[PDB]
Amino acid sequence: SMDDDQVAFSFILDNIVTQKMMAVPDSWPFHHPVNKKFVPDYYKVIVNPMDLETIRKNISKHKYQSRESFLDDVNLILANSVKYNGPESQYTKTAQEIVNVCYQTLTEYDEHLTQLEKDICTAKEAALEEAELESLD
Numbered sequence: 671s672m673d674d675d676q677v678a679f680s681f682i683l684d685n686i687v688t689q690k691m692m693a694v695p696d697s698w699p700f701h702h703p704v705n706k707k708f709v710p711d712y713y714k715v716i717v718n719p720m721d722l723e724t725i726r727k728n729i730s731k732h733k734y735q736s737r738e739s740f741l742d743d744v745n746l747i748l749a750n751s752v753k754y755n756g757p758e759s760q761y762t763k764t765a766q767e768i769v770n771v772c773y774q775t776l777t778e779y780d781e782h783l784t785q786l787e788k789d790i791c792t793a794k795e796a797a798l799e800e801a802e803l804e805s806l807d
């Protein structure tokens with residue numbers, strides 16, 4: 671089923687987040703959205719915030735249908751640290767390690783993720799066509 675495939679795709683991604691990315695030492699700065707009361711200027715500087723809790727929420731909503739779309743948000747965590755903290759900040763070195771262990775684990779699971787991604791896309795295109803042929807009956 672496409673639902674079955676979406677669940678498996680999302681579970682693989684969630685496991686990368688919880689078992690690999692969140693396990694990077696000293697990764698606490700990236701586990702949750704920045705609290706505006708704690709860092710009042712954060713949202714004046716960072717226009718497109720992202721963090722590992724938000725990624726997990728997006729996974730639970732099946733937002734990510736591709737490896738690329740998942741990695742778009744993973745990379746925002748790193749890019750926002752470069753912007754807010756600087757490219758040589760220890761915060762950014764930590765974010766870089768989060769991104770790198772993500773890549774490493776996506777590589778490990780690329781065959782299964784690619785197959786799920788393709789089959790989800792095929793199924794979605796077929797359901798779209800059938801929905802459209804139906805609406806015109």
Ligand SMILES: C[C@@H]1COCCN1c1cc(C2(S(C)(=O)=O)CC2)nc(-c2cccc3[nH]ccc23)n1
Nearest residue numbers: 698699700701702703704705708709754755761
């Ligand atoms: C901005 C800074 C560097 O760039 C990445 C995210 N960083 C975070 C994140 C968090 C959160 S939190 C607790 O707001 O949920 C998301 C985890 N807090 C604090 C923080 C809060 C209060 C006093 C502080 N003094 C130094 C850092 C700091 N900095």
